[PDB]
Design a protein around this nucleic acid. Structure first.
Ligand SMILES: C=C[C@]1(C)C[C@@H](OC(=O)CS[C@H]2C[C@H]3CC[C@@H](C2)N3C)[C@]2(C)[C@H](C)CC[C@]3(CCC(=O)[C@H]32)[C@@H](C)[C@@H]1O
Ligand SMILES: [K+]
Ligand SMILES: [K+]
Ligand SMILES: [K+]
Ligand SMILES: [K+]
Ligand SMILES: [K+]
Ligand SMILES: [K+]
Ligand SMILES: [K+]
Ligand SMILES: [K+]
Ligand SMILES: [K+]
Ligand SMILES: [K+]
Ligand SMILES: [K+]
Ligand SMILES: [K+]
Ligand SMILES: [K+]
Ligand SMILES: [K+]
Ligand SMILES: [K+]
Ligand SMILES: [K+]
Ligand SMILES: [K+]
Ligand SMILES: [K+]
Ligand SMILES: [K+]
Ligand SMILES: [K+]
Ligand SMILES: [K+]
Ligand SMILES: [K+]
Ligand SMILES: [K+]
Ligand SMILES: [Mg+2]
Ligand SMILES: [Mg+2]
Ligand SMILES: [Mg+2]
Ligand SMILES: [Mg+2]
Ligand SMILES: [Mg+2]
Ligand SMILES: [Mg+2]
Ligand SMILES: [Mg+2]
Ligand SMILES: [Mg+2]
Ligand SMILES: [Mg+2]
Ligand SMILES: [Mg+2]
Ligand SMILES: [Mg+2]
Ligand SMILES: [Mg+2]
Ligand SMILES: [Mg+2]
Ligand SMILES: [Mg+2]
Ligand SMILES: [Mg+2]
Ligand SMILES: [Mg+2]
Ligand SMILES: [Mg+2]
Ligand SMILES: [Mg+2]
Ligand SMILES: [Mg+2]
Ligand SMILES: [Mg+2]
Ligand SMILES: [Mg+2]
Ligand SMILES: [Mg+2]
Ligand SMILES: [Mg+2]
Ligand SMILES: [Mg+2]
Ligand SMILES: [Mg+2]
Ligand SMILES: [Mg+2]
Ligand SMILES: [Mg+2]
Ligand SMILES: [Mg+2]
Ligand SMILES: [Mg+2]
Ligand SMILES: [Mg+2]
Ligand SMILES: [Mg+2]
Ligand SMILES: [Mg+2]
Ligand SMILES: [Mg+2]
Ligand SMILES: [Mg+2]
Ligand SMILES: [Mg+2]
Ligand SMILES: [Mg+2]
Ligand SMILES: [Mg+2]
Ligand SMILES: [Mg+2]
Ligand SMILES: [Mg+2]
Ligand SMILES: [Mg+2]
Ligand SMILES: [Mg+2]
Ligand SMILES: [Mg+2]
Ligand SMILES: [Mg+2]
Ligand SMILES: [Mg+2]
Ligand SMILES: [Mg+2]
Ligand SMILES: [Mg+2]
Ligand SMILES: [Mg+2]
Ligand SMILES: [Mg+2]
Ligand SMILES: [Mg+2]
Ligand SMILES: [Mg+2]
Ligand SMILES: [Mg+2]
Ligand SMILES: [Mg+2]
Ligand SMILES: [Mg+2]
Ligand SMILES: [Mg+2]
Ligand SMILES: [Mg+2]
Ligand SMILES: [Mg+2]
Ligand SMILES: [Mg+2]
Ligand SMILES: [Mg+2]
Ligand SMILES: [Mg+2]
Ligand SMILES: [Mg+2]
Ligand SMILES: [Mg+2]
Lengths: 77, 57
RNA sequence: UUUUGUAUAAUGGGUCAGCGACUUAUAUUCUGUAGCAAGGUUAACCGAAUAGGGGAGCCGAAGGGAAACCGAGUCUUAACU
RNA sequence: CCGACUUACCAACCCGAUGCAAACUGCGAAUACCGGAGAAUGUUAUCACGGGAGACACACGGCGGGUGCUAACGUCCGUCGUGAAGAGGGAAACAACCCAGACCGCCAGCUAAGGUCCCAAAGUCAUGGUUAAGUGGGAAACGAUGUGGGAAGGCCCAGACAGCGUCGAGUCGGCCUGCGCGGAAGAUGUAACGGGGCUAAACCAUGCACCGAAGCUGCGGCAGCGACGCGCGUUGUUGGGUAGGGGAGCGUUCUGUAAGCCUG
RNA sequence: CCUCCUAAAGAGUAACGGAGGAGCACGAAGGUUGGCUAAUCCUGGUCGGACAUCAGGAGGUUAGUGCAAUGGCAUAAGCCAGCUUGACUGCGAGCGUGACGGCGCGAGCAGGUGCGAAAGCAGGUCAUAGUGAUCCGGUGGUUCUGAAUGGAAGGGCCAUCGCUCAACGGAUAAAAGGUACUCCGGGGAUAACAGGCUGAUACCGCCCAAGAGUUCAUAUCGACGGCGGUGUUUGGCACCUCGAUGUCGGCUCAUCACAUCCUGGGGCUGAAGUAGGUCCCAAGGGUAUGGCUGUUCGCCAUUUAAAGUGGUACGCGAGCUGG
RNA sequence: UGCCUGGCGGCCGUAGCGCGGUGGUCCCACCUGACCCCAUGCCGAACUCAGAAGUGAAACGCCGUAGCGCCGAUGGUAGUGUGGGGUCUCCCCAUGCGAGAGUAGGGAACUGCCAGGCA
């Protein structure tokens, strides 16, 4: 007859906006994410929704770093 | 060195990327022979559409 | 004709002849073309006058601001890097 | 107040083995996507802005899936192809499959898919095999000394196997595999190769011929776009199209040109 | 509106697909400084037990997160305390995401502030739901405007308030039904009939053989399961027909299939005979009348060698009937 | 220049555990006391301060040792882009890419700056 499902939320367009080696202007969003899947490295800020954004003009650099092998995003300015 | 490349089959029904490659080689129709420089870039194009071109080398 | 798709057993037409469907007015924008050009153009009307007169107006040469207002600036803001 | 033996016994944790997962992941591709660089090639194929739209019923096929019965020529997504809006050749006939994109003409040529005994264009082609079922040319579990190939065994002239010690040569049944057989009943008429017919004219392998399209080439012609030269030449390339956009024309009636011009 | 999966390792991606949540909460549950680290179990211990609190150890986040799910989180984003109001005002390089309206992220600048010795951090909260355009009107501020002039009214601007407008891009401030008395424009874009595709279901075969059959699976039957065939019931789908493809049953007239009811041939039998059972071959011909009911069917009566089963637009209304 | 110790990094398990040693001159640790500075939702346990008699017991560092964790070929397998094929619910062929798991094996980290002790 009827079903109790049939709901879903709008897709949030998360994920990587600027990949490795891409030249960005300061302020450019590099990744939108839920929590810190990626962490802010050098010249990268972490917004209130865990958005990583460039704090300097330069090139995006993904790196695995530290004792937990966490993924950091940096900007090579 | 230059290589002669002849188109042997139709582009009709081929993938867009394959049509783009034939355009990249400058092949216009079945039987059209073009003379191109033997470079890795040209060889990769041939490789991508090797089923529908013949290389005389 | 309509359709994803019609020989279709979907639609329409018995045939011929004649008639039968994107117009007209005004406004507005764009294009072309012609005139004149930081100007362009007149409306009613007058004029027997397609002339000539009539520049009332309209558009343009300045914008910004809700506005007062300021003005190659202006608004925003107590003030802008 | 307790305890102690005790179980057809039911048993968590932990340990060792075994699987399973769209909403599991201590792993993790191919692809795809984003960015950078470099050639060649491509009628700028790109982006922006402005004039004009149409369209917002899609269909099938392939691949990845949800749903459904991994039912539907079903339904709903993703992605590519074709149809739509695409003729030609093939698939008997057959939008959507295969081949292939029709500017025009030719009583030239070469090919594609697909074919070559007759209908019907081209091999009654070659070589080696398989099938005997018209299998080919509809159908499963399963059944069976059909028949071909391969590897390996048991037993055997100290006589095996079958028949009745005799008898003198092989016998026995598993394995893997090729092709067949049964399983296999439907309604107008053969009617489940398109038909004739076929024992290859079937199937497999190999090879060389040929046929075969509106594909390609040849010859002649027309037009669009772009170069490079001086509207002309030379040269490159393009010309299937519905909605629809753009360009250029034909003819009709009427007005001027026209008291002209044609007309008993 | 949010979260996951479907979703094909960028984004996005449908279904009356599979699962759950939201329409808030919080002046601390916000800011900052300083500090801290979980579940669970084992051993011991007043009451005290499986589980309270205490002590030690094992363990290592298997906890926790104001509330779903996912992704995060130890430098914790988790837990505790001090001081606080950055849950600041004006702006904003740049970027994400949207058809748009919008929505989001944001360093930095100015002013003023909190916490910290300081570097610093703070424009709410681990993040992602907790929402409502415009109009109309309300309240406070602001001489911006003020229809002769000065005022004022009203308007503007800034701040803010009023919607389960939840059918949530929100037709109106304000709205239920009937039509077999019906009507128009349309559609085979879409149902009812028949056809088609399909074959779950149905019907008919077959495979395995537990077992029943005194004994004995296979005379006969065939549990648990397995594989097909037909197009044949109930359905699924919506491809043909809505500028009409007349419909149940009967009557008349049929025609084909064979899965055979009778008659014909045959094997097996748990076949003495008679008469059966079962299977194979066989479609030549044959194959009830009545009672009841619109019935088809069915039950009943009485026949018959038998009273077959199906297909044919559930054969047959330009052939009849009209229950 | 070697050996030891401390601090701060690189790196983020070949680097971590376990298990057997081993070190006190120096350094480190525990340690010794607390009217003090500061501290305990109780407690000088911690934090903090004033110290140096004692011990390396614990911890810590170092060394050894595969029982683990960890790393890990080669080959094969799975998957898969493109093209092609079949008996098409699934496969196969050509070509390109090629895991995961497991196997052999590796494996008791390595390294920069500064300071101090010793030789
Ligand atoms: C009018 C249509 C009729 C004569 C009858 C029709 O039956 C119906 O449509 C049932 S509704 C019924 C039909 C007529 C007209 C009004 C009233 C209602 N009643 C007297 C009926 C049985 C079908 C169900 C639909 C298709 C039909 C063709 C074939 C068929 O069996 C017909 C149509 C196309 C036919 O023209
Ligand atoms: K960006
Ligand atoms: K139609
Ligand atoms: K009709
Ligand atoms: K106009
Ligand atoms: K003009
Ligand atoms: K400005
Ligand atoms: K598809
Ligand atoms: K096409
Ligand atoms: K045959
Ligand atoms: K707080
Ligand atoms: K500030
Ligand atoms: K609505
Ligand atoms: K009404
Ligand atoms: K059967
Ligand atoms: K028996
Ligand atoms: K109809
Ligand atoms: K009949
Ligand atoms: K019998
Ligand atoms: K008969
Ligand atoms: K009918
Ligand atoms: K009737
Ligand atoms: K009729
Ligand atoms: K009649
Ligand atoms: Mg989501
Ligand atoms: Mg880390
Ligand atoms: Mg239709
Ligand atoms: Mg046709
Ligand atoms: Mg038809
Ligand atoms: Mg017709
Ligand atoms: Mg006809
Ligand atoms: Mg019609
Ligand atoms: Mg007609
Ligand atoms: Mg102005
Ligand atoms: Mg629509
Ligand atoms: Mg649509
Ligand atoms: Mg679609
Ligand atoms: Mg599919
Ligand atoms: Mg469909
Ligand atoms: Mg399908
Ligand atoms: Mg159409
Ligand atoms: Mg065609
Ligand atoms: Mg054709
Ligand atoms: Mg044909
Ligand atoms: Mg030839
Ligand atoms: Mg011939
Ligand atoms: Mg021969
Ligand atoms: Mg046959
Ligand atoms: Mg067979
Ligand atoms: Mg027949
Ligand atoms: Mg030809
Ligand atoms: Mg041609
Ligand atoms: Mg063409
Ligand atoms: Mg054309
Ligand atoms: Mg005239
Ligand atoms: Mg995605
Ligand atoms: Mg993807
Ligand atoms: Mg889409
Ligand atoms: Mg906090
Ligand atoms: Mg909080
Ligand atoms: Mg939260
Ligand atoms: Mg109003
Ligand atoms: Mg006044
Ligand atoms: Mg007044
Ligand atoms: Mg709505
Ligand atoms: Mg009507
Ligand atoms: Mg339809
Ligand atoms: Mg029907
Ligand atoms: Mg049906
Ligand atoms: Mg449909
Ligand atoms: Mg029909
Ligand atoms: Mg009609
Ligand atoms: Mg029979
Ligand atoms: Mg007969
Ligand atoms: Mg006879
Ligand atoms: Mg009767
Ligand atoms: Mg009937
Ligand atoms: Mg009948
Ligand atoms: Mg009648
Ligand atoms: Mg009739
Ligand atoms: Mg009646
Ligand atoms: Mg102490
Ligand atoms: Mg010790
Ligand atoms: Mg590996
Ligand atoms: Mg060790």
């Amino acid at each position: 007859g009827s079903t109790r499902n049939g709901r879903d939320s709008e897709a949030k367009r998360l994920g990587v906006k600027r990949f490795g080696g891409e030249s960005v202007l300061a302020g450019s969003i590099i990744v939108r994410q839920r929590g810190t899947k990626f962490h802010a490295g050098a010249n990268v800020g972490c917004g209130r929704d865990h958005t990583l954004f460039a704090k300097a003009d330069g090139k995006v650099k993904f790196e695995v770093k530290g004792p937990k092998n966490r993924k950091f995003i940096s900007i090579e300015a | 060195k230059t290589i002669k490349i002849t188109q042997t089959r139709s582009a009709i029904g081929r993938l867009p990327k394959h049509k783009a490659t034939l355009l990249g080689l400058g092949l216009r129709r079945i039987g059209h022979t073009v003379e191109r420089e033997d470079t890795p870039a040209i060889r990769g194009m041939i490789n991508a559409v090797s089923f529908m071109v013949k290389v005389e080398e």
